Amino acid sequence: DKKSYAGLEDVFSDNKSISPNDKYMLLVFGRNGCSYCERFKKDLKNVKELRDYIKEHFSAYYVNISYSKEHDFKVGDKNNEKEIKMSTEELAQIYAVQSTPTIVLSDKTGKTIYELPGYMPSTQFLAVLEFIGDGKYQDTKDDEDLTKKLKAYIKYKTNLSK
C-alpha cells in the first residue's frame, strides 16, 4: 500500500509504473515488520541533504514485498524502451531480492549500476548516492575498480562528516 511509505510521497513515485524517466533510478524493496526498512525511511524523512539529493537525481520507488501488485516496468534507451507488466514477486526475482531492505541503483536506461542488500547509515548512503548521481561511477574500469573507488569515496565523505 501507499501506507508503506506514508509521508515520503515527495520522494517515491507510484510503483504501478516503474521507469527511470530520464533520471537515475532508485528501487527500494521493503516489507512489513522490517526494522531496518523503518530506519531507512526515518533517514529519508529526517536527513534533509539525503532527501533533497534523492529528489534531485532519482526516480525512486518503494516496493513492499509483503503484498503483490502489478507493476508496469519500463527500461531501455530512448530508441528502444521495453515495457513489461509484472508482479511484485517477478520484479523482486529479476533483482534477486533476498533480504530487506534491498536498494538498487540504476542508470537512466535502467541498467543496474549498484545494489545494497541491506541498510546503510545516512552519511555512507548519501555517499553511495552521490557516487552514482554525480556520474563518478562512469570513470571506472570494472566491477572491482568501481567497488574500490566507491569504498574510497565513502571513507572520504565519512571523514568529511566528522
JSON list of C-alpha atoms in Angstrom, two decimals:
[
{"chain": "A", "resi": 1, "resn": "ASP", "atom": "CA", "xyz": [0.00, 0.00, 0.00]},
{"chain": "A", "resi": 2, "resn": "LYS", "atom": "CA", "xyz": [0.90, 3.73, -0.18]},
{"chain": "A", "resi": 3, "resn": "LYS", "atom": "CA", "xyz": [0.95, 3.35, 3.59]},
{"chain": "A", "resi": 4, "resn": "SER", "atom": "CA", "xyz": [4.27, 1.53, 3.17]},
{"chain": "A", "resi": 5, "resn": "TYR", "atom": "CA", "xyz": [5.94, 4.93, 2.75]},
{"chain": "A", "resi": 6, "resn": "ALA", "atom": "CA", "xyz": [3.43, 7.42, 4.26]},
{"chain": "A", "resi": 7, "resn": "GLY", "atom": "CA", "xyz": [4.97, 10.92, 4.37]},
{"chain": "A", "resi": 8, "resn": "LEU", "atom": "CA", "xyz": [7.60, 10.12, 1.69]},
{"chain": "A", "resi": 9, "resn": "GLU", "atom": "CA", "xyz": [5.31, 10.67, -1.35]},
{"chain": "A", "resi": 10, "resn": "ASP", "atom": "CA", "xyz": [7.68, 13.57, -2.17]},
{"chain": "A", "resi": 11, "resn": "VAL", "atom": "CA", "xyz": [10.50, 11.00, -2.70]},
{"chain": "A", "resi": 12, "resn": "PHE", "atom": "CA", "xyz": [8.72, 7.91, -4.02]},
{"chain": "A", "resi": 13, "resn": "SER", "atom": "CA", "xyz": [6.59, 7.79, -7.16]},
{"chain": "A", "resi": 14, "resn": "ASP", "atom": "CA", "xyz": [3.68, 5.38, -7.51]},
{"chain": "A", "resi": 15, "resn": "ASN", "atom": "CA", "xyz": [5.16, 1.91, -8.20]},
{"chain": "A", "resi": 16, "resn": "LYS", "atom": "CA", "xyz": [2.32, 0.94, -10.51]},
{"chain": "A", "resi": 17, "resn": "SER", "atom": "CA", "xyz": [4.57, 2.48, -13.23]},
{"chain": "A", "resi": 18, "resn": "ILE", "atom": "CA", "xyz": [8.30, 1.99, -12.73]},
{"chain": "A", "resi": 19, "resn": "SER", "atom": "CA", "xyz": [10.78, 3.69, -15.05]},
{"chain": "A", "resi": 20, "resn": "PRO", "atom": "CA", "xyz": [13.95, 5.81, -14.67]},
{"chain": "A", "resi": 21, "resn": "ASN", "atom": "CA", "xyz": [12.13, 8.59, -16.57]},
{"chain": "A", "resi": 22, "resn": "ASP", "atom": "CA", "xyz": [15.37, 10.22, -17.66]},
{"chain": "A", "resi": 23, "resn": "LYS", "atom": "CA", "xyz": [16.84, 10.21, -14.15]},
{"chain": "A", "resi": 24, "resn": "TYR", "atom": "CA", "xyz": [18.87, 7.66, -12.26]},
{"chain": "A", "resi": 25, "resn": "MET", "atom": "CA", "xyz": [16.57, 5.01, -10.78]},
{"chain": "A", "resi": 26, "resn": "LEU", "atom": "CA", "xyz": [16.35, 4.04, -7.12]},
{"chain": "A", "resi": 27, "resn": "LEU", "atom": "CA", "xyz": [14.35, 0.91, -6.24]},
{"chain": "A", "resi": 28, "resn": "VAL", "atom": "CA", "xyz": [13.87, 0.02, -2.58]},
{"chain": "A", "resi": 29, "resn": "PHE", "atom": "CA", "xyz": [12.48, -3.42, -1.79]},
{"chain": "A", "resi": 30, "resn": "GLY", "atom": "CA", "xyz": [10.99, -3.39, 1.69]},
{"chain": "A", "resi": 31, "resn": "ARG", "atom": "CA", "xyz": [8.40, -5.23, 3.76]},
{"chain": "A", "resi": 32, "resn": "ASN", "atom": "CA", "xyz": [6.10, -5.06, 6.77]},
{"chain": "A", "resi": 33, "resn": "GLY", "atom": "CA", "xyz": [7.70, -5.59, 10.23]},
{"chain": "A", "resi": 34, "resn": "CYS", "atom": "CA", "xyz": [11.19, -4.85, 8.95]},
{"chain": "A", "resi": 35, "resn": "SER", "atom": "CA", "xyz": [13.07, -2.71, 11.44]},
{"chain": "A", "resi": 36, "resn": "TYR", "atom": "CA", "xyz": [15.87, -1.76, 9.05]},
{"chain": "A", "resi": 37, "resn": "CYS", "atom": "CA", "xyz": [13.23, -0.72, 6.48]},
{"chain": "A", "resi": 38, "resn": "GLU", "atom": "CA", "xyz": [11.78, 1.55, 9.18]},
{"chain": "A", "resi": 39, "resn": "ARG", "atom": "CA", "xyz": [15.22, 3.00, 9.99]},
{"chain": "A", "resi": 40, "resn": "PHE", "atom": "CA", "xyz": [15.88, 3.60, 6.27]},
{"chain": "A", "resi": 41, "resn": "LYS", "atom": "CA", "xyz": [12.60, 5.52, 5.91]},
{"chain": "A", "resi": 42, "resn": "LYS", "atom": "CA", "xyz": [13.36, 7.67, 9.01]},
{"chain": "A", "resi": 43, "resn": "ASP", "atom": "CA", "xyz": [16.70, 8.66, 7.42]},
{"chain": "A", "resi": 44, "resn": "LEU", "atom": "CA", "xyz": [14.95, 9.63, 4.19]},
{"chain": "A", "resi": 45, "resn": "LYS", "atom": "CA", "xyz": [12.47, 11.74, 6.17]},
{"chain": "A", "resi": 46, "resn": "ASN", "atom": "CA", "xyz": [14.83, 13.43, 8.60]},
{"chain": "A", "resi": 47, "resn": "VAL", "atom": "CA", "xyz": [18.16, 13.95, 6.76]},
{"chain": "A", "resi": 48, "resn": "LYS", "atom": "CA", "xyz": [17.33, 16.89, 4.51]},
{"chain": "A", "resi": 49, "resn": "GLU", "atom": "CA", "xyz": [20.52, 16.58, 2.42]},
{"chain": "A", "resi": 50, "resn": "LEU", "atom": "CA", "xyz": [19.73, 12.93, 1.68]},
{"chain": "A", "resi": 51, "resn": "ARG", "atom": "CA", "xyz": [16.07, 13.66, 0.96]},
{"chain": "A", "resi": 52, "resn": "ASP", "atom": "CA", "xyz": [16.94, 16.60, -1.38]},
{"chain": "A", "resi": 53, "resn": "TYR", "atom": "CA", "xyz": [19.67, 14.67, -3.18]},
{"chain": "A", "resi": 54, "resn": "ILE", "atom": "CA", "xyz": [17.30, 11.76, -3.96]},
{"chain": "A", "resi": 55, "resn": "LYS", "atom": "CA", "xyz": [14.57, 14.13, -5.13]},
{"chain": "A", "resi": 56, "resn": "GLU", "atom": "CA", "xyz": [17.03, 15.97, -7.41]},
{"chain": "A", "resi": 57, "resn": "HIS", "atom": "CA", "xyz": [18.73, 12.98, -9.07]},
{"chain": "A", "resi": 58, "resn": "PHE", "atom": "CA", "xyz": [16.48, 9.89, -8.81]},
{"chain": "A", "resi": 59, "resn": "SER", "atom": "CA", "xyz": [13.18, 8.40, -9.85]},
{"chain": "A", "resi": 60, "resn": "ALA", "atom": "CA", "xyz": [12.53, 6.47, -6.65]},
{"chain": "A", "resi": 61, "resn": "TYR", "atom": "CA", "xyz": [10.15, 3.62, -5.88]},
{"chain": "A", "resi": 62, "resn": "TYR", "atom": "CA", "xyz": [9.36, 1.67, -2.70]},
{"chain": "A", "resi": 63, "resn": "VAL", "atom": "CA", "xyz": [8.13, -1.86, -3.37]},
{"chain": "A", "resi": 64, "resn": "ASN", "atom": "CA", "xyz": [6.62, -3.64, -0.38]},
{"chain": "A", "resi": 65, "resn": "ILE", "atom": "CA", "xyz": [7.04, -7.41, -0.90]},
{"chain": "A", "resi": 66, "resn": "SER", "atom": "CA", "xyz": [4.52, -8.08, 1.89]},
{"chain": "A", "resi": 67, "resn": "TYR", "atom": "CA", "xyz": [1.93, -7.52, -0.87]},
{"chain": "A", "resi": 68, "resn": "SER", "atom": "CA", "xyz": [1.55, -8.46, -4.53]},
{"chain": "A", "resi": 69, "resn": "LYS", "atom": "CA", "xyz": [0.76, -5.72, -7.09]},
{"chain": "A", "resi": 70, "resn": "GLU", "atom": "CA", "xyz": [1.15, -5.45, -10.85]},
{"chain": "A", "resi": 71, "resn": "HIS", "atom": "CA", "xyz": [3.94, -3.12, -11.94]},
{"chain": "A", "resi": 72, "resn": "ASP", "atom": "CA", "xyz": [4.42, -1.60, -15.40]},
{"chain": "A", "resi": 73, "resn": "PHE", "atom": "CA", "xyz": [8.18, -1.78, -15.63]},
{"chain": "A", "resi": 74, "resn": "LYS", "atom": "CA", "xyz": [9.76, 0.34, -18.38]},
{"chain": "A", "resi": 75, "resn": "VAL", "atom": "CA", "xyz": [13.53, 0.21, -19.10]},
{"chain": "A", "resi": 76, "resn": "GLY", "atom": "CA", "xyz": [15.89, 0.58, -22.13]},
{"chain": "A", "resi": 77, "resn": "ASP", "atom": "CA", "xyz": [17.15, 3.67, -24.01]},
{"chain": "A", "resi": 78, "resn": "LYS", "atom": "CA", "xyz": [15.10, 6.18, -25.97]},
{"chain": "A", "resi": 79, "resn": "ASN", "atom": "CA", "xyz": [15.37, 4.23, -29.17]},
{"chain": "A", "resi": 80, "resn": "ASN", "atom": "CA", "xyz": [14.07, 1.07, -27.61]},
{"chain": "A", "resi": 81, "resn": "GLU", "atom": "CA", "xyz": [12.08, 1.04, -24.42]},
{"chain": "A", "resi": 82, "resn": "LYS", "atom": "CA", "xyz": [10.72, -2.32, -23.27]},
{"chain": "A", "resi": 83, "resn": "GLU", "atom": "CA", "xyz": [7.54, -2.20, -21.17]},
{"chain": "A", "resi": 84, "resn": "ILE", "atom": "CA", "xyz": [6.50, -5.32, -19.25]},
{"chain": "A", "resi": 85, "resn": "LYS", "atom": "CA", "xyz": [3.68, -5.79, -16.71]},
{"chain": "A", "resi": 86, "resn": "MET", "atom": "CA", "xyz": [4.98, -7.93, -13.86]},
{"chain": "A", "resi": 87, "resn": "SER", "atom": "CA", "xyz": [4.01, -8.96, -10.34]},
{"chain": "A", "resi": 88, "resn": "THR", "atom": "CA", "xyz": [5.82, -7.73, -7.24]},
{"chain": "A", "resi": 89, "resn": "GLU", "atom": "CA", "xyz": [7.28, -11.27, -6.99]},
{"chain": "A", "resi": 90, "resn": "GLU", "atom": "CA", "xyz": [8.56, -11.28, -10.57]},
{"chain": "A", "resi": 91, "resn": "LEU", "atom": "CA", "xyz": [10.11, -7.80, -10.08]},
{"chain": "A", "resi": 92, "resn": "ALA", "atom": "CA", "xyz": [11.93, -8.92, -6.88]},
{"chain": "A", "resi": 93, "resn": "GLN", "atom": "CA", "xyz": [13.08, -12.12, -8.64]},
{"chain": "A", "resi": 94, "resn": "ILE", "atom": "CA", "xyz": [14.56, -10.15, -11.55]},
{"chain": "A", "resi": 95, "resn": "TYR", "atom": "CA", "xyz": [16.65, -8.25, -8.96]},
{"chain": "A", "resi": 96, "resn": "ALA", "atom": "CA", "xyz": [17.26, -11.40, -6.99]},
{"chain": "A", "resi": 97, "resn": "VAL", "atom": "CA", "xyz": [15.93, -9.88, -3.79]},
{"chain": "A", "resi": 98, "resn": "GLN", "atom": "CA", "xyz": [16.74, -11.96, -0.76]},
{"chain": "A", "resi": 99, "resn": "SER", "atom": "CA", "xyz": [16.61, -9.64, 2.12]},
{"chain": "A", "resi": 100, "resn": "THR", "atom": "CA", "xyz": [15.10, -6.38, 3.07]},
{"chain": "A", "resi": 101, "resn": "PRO", "atom": "CA", "xyz": [15.71, -3.61, 2.67]},
{"chain": "A", "resi": 102, "resn": "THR", "atom": "CA", "xyz": [17.36, -4.16, -0.71]},
{"chain": "A", "resi": 103, "resn": "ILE", "atom": "CA", "xyz": [18.37, -0.97, -2.54]},
{"chain": "A", "resi": 104, "resn": "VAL", "atom": "CA", "xyz": [19.03, -0.95, -6.29]},
{"chain": "A", "resi": 105, "resn": "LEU", "atom": "CA", "xyz": [20.61, 2.00, -8.11]},
{"chain": "A", "resi": 106, "resn": "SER", "atom": "CA", "xyz": [20.26, 2.04, -11.92]},
{"chain": "A", "resi": 107, "resn": "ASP", "atom": "CA", "xyz": [21.20, 4.41, -14.72]},
{"chain": "A", "resi": 108, "resn": "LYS", "atom": "CA", "xyz": [18.79, 6.33, -16.98]},
{"chain": "A", "resi": 109, "resn": "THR", "atom": "CA", "xyz": [18.45, 3.36, -19.38]},
{"chain": "A", "resi": 110, "resn": "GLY", "atom": "CA", "xyz": [17.52, 1.14, -16.40]},
{"chain": "A", "resi": 111, "resn": "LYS", "atom": "CA", "xyz": [20.86, -0.63, -16.33]},
{"chain": "A", "resi": 112, "resn": "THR", "atom": "CA", "xyz": [21.75, -1.70, -12.80]},
{"chain": "A", "resi": 113, "resn": "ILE", "atom": "CA", "xyz": [24.85, 0.11, -11.54]},
{"chain": "A", "resi": 114, "resn": "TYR", "atom": "CA", "xyz": [24.92, -0.96, -7.91]},
{"chain": "A", "resi": 115, "resn": "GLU", "atom": "CA", "xyz": [22.93, -2.87, -5.31]},
{"chain": "A", "resi": 116, "resn": "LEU", "atom": "CA", "xyz": [22.95, -2.72, -1.49]},
{"chain": "A", "resi": 117, "resn": "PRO", "atom": "CA", "xyz": [21.33, -5.79, 0.10]},
{"chain": "A", "resi": 118, "resn": "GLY", "atom": "CA", "xyz": [20.79, -4.01, 3.46]},
{"chain": "A", "resi": 119, "resn": "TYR", "atom": "CA", "xyz": [20.62, -0.80, 5.48]},
{"chain": "A", "resi": 120, "resn": "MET", "atom": "CA", "xyz": [23.44, 1.77, 5.47]},
{"chain": "A", "resi": 121, "resn": "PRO", "atom": "CA", "xyz": [23.61, 4.89, 7.74]},
{"chain": "A", "resi": 122, "resn": "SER", "atom": "CA", "xyz": [22.71, 8.15, 6.04]},
{"chain": "A", "resi": 123, "resn": "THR", "atom": "CA", "xyz": [26.27, 9.51, 5.72]},
{"chain": "A", "resi": 124, "resn": "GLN", "atom": "CA", "xyz": [27.52, 6.42, 3.88]},
{"chain": "A", "resi": 125, "resn": "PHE", "atom": "CA", "xyz": [24.25, 6.03, 1.95]},
{"chain": "A", "resi": 126, "resn": "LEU", "atom": "CA", "xyz": [24.34, 9.63, 0.66]},
{"chain": "A", "resi": 127, "resn": "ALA", "atom": "CA", "xyz": [27.94, 8.99, -0.47]},
{"chain": "A", "resi": 128, "resn": "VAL", "atom": "CA", "xyz": [26.81, 5.96, -2.49]},
{"chain": "A", "resi": 129, "resn": "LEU", "atom": "CA", "xyz": [24.00, 8.06, -3.99]},
{"chain": "A", "resi": 130, "resn": "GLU", "atom": "CA", "xyz": [26.38, 10.89, -4.97]},
{"chain": "A", "resi": 131, "resn": "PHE", "atom": "CA", "xyz": [28.89, 8.43, -6.49]},
{"chain": "A", "resi": 132, "resn": "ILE", "atom": "CA", "xyz": [26.09, 7.27, -8.82]},
{"chain": "A", "resi": 133, "resn": "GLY", "atom": "CA", "xyz": [24.17, 10.56, -9.16]},
{"chain": "A", "resi": 134, "resn": "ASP", "atom": "CA", "xyz": [27.15, 12.79, -9.97]},
{"chain": "A", "resi": 135, "resn": "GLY", "atom": "CA", "xyz": [28.30, 10.24, -12.60]},
{"chain": "A", "resi": 136, "resn": "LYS", "atom": "CA", "xyz": [31.54, 9.37, -10.78]},
{"chain": "A", "resi": 137, "resn": "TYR", "atom": "CA", "xyz": [30.90, 5.67, -11.38]},
{"chain": "A", "resi": 138, "resn": "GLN", "atom": "CA", "xyz": [31.29, 6.23, -15.05]},
{"chain": "A", "resi": 139, "resn": "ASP", "atom": "CA", "xyz": [35.01, 6.55, -14.85]},
{"chain": "A", "resi": 140, "resn": "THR", "atom": "CA", "xyz": [35.79, 3.08, -13.64]},
{"chain": "A", "resi": 141, "resn": "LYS", "atom": "CA", "xyz": [37.37, 0.10, -15.35]},
{"chain": "A", "resi": 142, "resn": "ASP", "atom": "CA", "xyz": [35.30, -2.77, -13.96]},
{"chain": "A", "resi": 143, "resn": "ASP", "atom": "CA", "xyz": [33.11, -4.05, -11.08]},
{"chain": "A", "resi": 144, "resn": "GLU", "atom": "CA", "xyz": [36.21, -4.40, -8.90]},
{"chain": "A", "resi": 145, "resn": "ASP", "atom": "CA", "xyz": [37.52, -0.88, -9.62]},
{"chain": "A", "resi": 146, "resn": "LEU", "atom": "CA", "xyz": [34.03, 0.63, -9.16]},
{"chain": "A", "resi": 147, "resn": "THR", "atom": "CA", "xyz": [33.66, -1.07, -5.74]},
{"chain": "A", "resi": 148, "resn": "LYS", "atom": "CA", "xyz": [37.15, 0.14, -4.77]},
{"chain": "A", "resi": 149, "resn": "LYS", "atom": "CA", "xyz": [36.52, 3.76, -5.87]},
{"chain": "A", "resi": 150, "resn": "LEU", "atom": "CA", "xyz": [33.06, 3.77, -4.20]},
{"chain": "A", "resi": 151, "resn": "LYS", "atom": "CA", "xyz": [34.56, 2.46, -0.94]},
{"chain": "A", "resi": 152, "resn": "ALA", "atom": "CA", "xyz": [37.21, 5.22, -1.17]},
{"chain": "A", "resi": 153, "resn": "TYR", "atom": "CA", "xyz": [34.56, 7.89, -1.76]},
{"chain": "A", "resi": 154, "resn": "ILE", "atom": "CA", "xyz": [32.52, 6.65, 1.25]},
{"chain": "A", "resi": 155, "resn": "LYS", "atom": "CA", "xyz": [35.51, 6.89, 3.64]},
{"chain": "A", "resi": 156, "resn": "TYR", "atom": "CA", "xyz": [36.15, 10.39, 2.26]},
{"chain": "A", "resi": 157, "resn": "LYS", "atom": "CA", "xyz": [32.57, 11.51, 2.99]},
{"chain": "A", "resi": 158, "resn": "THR", "atom": "CA", "xyz": [32.80, 9.83, 6.43]},
{"chain": "A", "resi": 159, "resn": "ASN", "atom": "CA", "xyz": [35.96, 11.89, 7.20]},
{"chain": "A", "resi": 160, "resn": "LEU", "atom": "CA", "xyz": [34.10, 14.95, 5.97]},
{"chain": "A", "resi": 161, "resn": "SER", "atom": "CA", "xyz": [31.08, 14.36, 8.27]},
{"chain": "A", "resi": 162, "resn": "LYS", "atom": "CA", "xyz": [33.20, 14.35, 11.47]}
]
